[model samples]
Target: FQGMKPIHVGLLGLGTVGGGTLTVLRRNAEEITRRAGREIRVVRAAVRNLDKAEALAGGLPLTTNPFDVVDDPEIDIVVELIGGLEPARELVMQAIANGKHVVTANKHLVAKYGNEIFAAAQAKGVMVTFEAAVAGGIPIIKALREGLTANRIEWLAGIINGTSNFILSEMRDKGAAFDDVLKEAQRLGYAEADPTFDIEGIDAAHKLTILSAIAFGIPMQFERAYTEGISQLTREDVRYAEELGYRIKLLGIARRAENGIELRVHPTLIPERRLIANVDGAMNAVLVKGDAVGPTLYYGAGAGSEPTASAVVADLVDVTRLHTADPHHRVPHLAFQPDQLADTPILPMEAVRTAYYLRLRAFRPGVLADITRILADSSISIDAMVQKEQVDIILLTHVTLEKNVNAAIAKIEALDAVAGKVMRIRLEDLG
Candidate 1:
């Protein structure tokens, strides 16, 4: 056993997950100590109101200025709970510079600035663990970074956002209007005040960016992630997908394509019985396909204080166990050595090839003929079609290049017979 004192942790946020971390550490103190061969304890916590956390924190040290925790000499690890990109980045870096390991659940920070942070940790020989950065309570990062290290990960698809998934699920189950349900979601605390990030696919894209890097051994490229939210999703589309034996999900997809990586988050259609199709409401699931492992699914609560905290604390445990291990021997930040990370660009959406769900409203006669002609002209072929009375005409296309979809949309929109704006959603077989 490595003779050492307790591993001290300083928490940067005492919110939900911070509270949960404290609870878990206390509840599992002996188990954690046995595994790490050292007691893991929360020494200091940064909070907006120290008094508010008094009931839950059980009298642990608390401070308002987070930097004090970063600079605290007694703290062996820093767990950043405050979300966002600014001071979180700087504070995490400071902790690493102070010869401390860091754990965080901020997907935005990891997606945007992980490369720089990981590089700094490597140079300083300190670890930065972010198991909670992707799906909350789902050890997908470990599966990619360590468990399935031998496999060449081919592709992954996930329902990575709870708010959007909840909206979609509500629309399906209650037949509620998208806008109405979204408002309810905001009121229920499942979504942010703005809720744009969660609804607009930005949140899912951020999570996908982190997962993509880990799965593909690529650098963090949040800018390249193509995002489309589910706010515009309609009840008609939901019913239509159901009729077609499919489910409409806000999906974060990353696949190893022939040319480059496909990193996109949008509404997608999947067959109803697919295990991922059943994942609904305030939950997240990721399906990873590897050459060796074949396929694996990781599912759990995608958000919340305690669920996310479970992952954050788990990361702390891993880091503590491997604290003295050679930096080179530890898992790479993106599941590959810095030199091994790929420069493969995120493929443009138009260059992506997939099936499509197209909905159009038409007043002109013979418009289906016109649309079909347009699709054919663009080298697109229809797999199925449903012409609803009056306002809704739906088309499902077989596997076609995104360029073809763009061309078809352009052609159909220019036609006098074609109605207003077309509704288009991408499709993936996940086969």
Candidate 2:
């Protein structure tokens, strides 16, 4: 074996995650090298402010130009911490074209362009790892890629977006409205000023797209994944969920059905007794069901400078160890032979089947009979129900096709005594 020679790393951005990555590598240099059989050094970086980048990076060579790092010959790996789709897409593709390995925390890159990026990496025999992209430092990607390699994954669900989880947790725990809790979230730095990505379910859907691709060996289909944000959730819905022994959570779910895969993200009703349902605040958890492992839950801090850097540096160690091996022998990018990836179609929401929680305000006595009849005519059965003063009706329905619920809701909305639109939240036993 050769003696430890430091592997040179060129960072593409000197932001929170970038500075944290360097902080970790330097702090844990000895231990990291002991495991990696080589020292990982941040030799250069691209930054917006060369002066501030030097202070944050502790004198790592800095440049305003990203190409200086990706185009350099000495840098063994390019770590792209800069987010966004534009320049990131072209720059990462440039790094691959230059035959350098990659470690990126960009879920947008992986979720939308992973197939394209991985194909480029494959053609050049370099690794492109994105452990920090999904659930921060939770290592769910590693668990899916290596630990569960022996078993066929059945289904997986996750509270992957910390910002949304925080907002929902506050809404339930503090009896706060959506706008109120969201403002608090922004103040607490858990949410962005814009907050669209985190609140609109696009962020969760992006991570889910990656999880689905790896879990089921399917191509990334974010467009087909149904995304329903938590913005519409009312305090009444949260209280009603609790009254029905369930919690409302924004969940990213991917299931393997006989015909195809089911990929969706929405506010879900999971039994309060389930472990994932109790994951509150700005934390993250994933419940993955494998053939042999049953259901395994992984939870941890989903975001922050250090926690995300833990994953970024771990990827560095992995790339360092695996870089010397036969590219053919290294793990496939998506944990499946690229050519063997399934063309499984994602089930549309209408065809997706799950239990539902329906809340309605009925103004007349005959409304109950009408509601039951409509659901029954569509072959939907109620699992549980509650009526508040014969006005507020909360019904938990048995598992049924989403189309049936859509049809029933249409009928219930048109009833003479019904008020406004019916509130529907999908329910999951997670069994």
Candidate 2 versus the native: TM-score? 0.97
TM-scores of all models? 0.96, 0.97
Compose the digit string of candidate 1's lDDT tens values, residues 1-431: 66478888899877778888898888888788887768887888988887787876777888899878999888889998888987798899889889888898989998899899888877777878888888898988988888988999999999999989999998999998998898888898777788888899998999999889988989989999899988788888999999998999999999999999999999999999899999998889999999998989998898887788788878888887787454465454324246667789889988999999999877756878888888889999999998884457899999988988997898898978666888999888886
State the displacement of the C-alpha of residue 122, model 2, in Å, after optimal TM-score superposition: 0.5
lDDT of 2 at 155: 97
User: In model 1, what lDDT does residue 146 have?
Assistant: 84
lDDT of 2 by residue, 1-431 (tens): 56357788998887888889988998998889988877787888988788767768877878899999999998889999988897889999999999899999999878888888888787887888999998999999899988998979999999999999999999999998999899988888888899998998999999999999989888788889999999889898998888778898999999997677899999999999999999999899999999999999999988889999999999998888887554465455434246778787999998899999888887855778999999999999998888863388899899999999999899999998887888888999997
The per-residue C-alpha lDDT of model 1 at residue 398 equals 96
lDDT of 2 at 169: 91
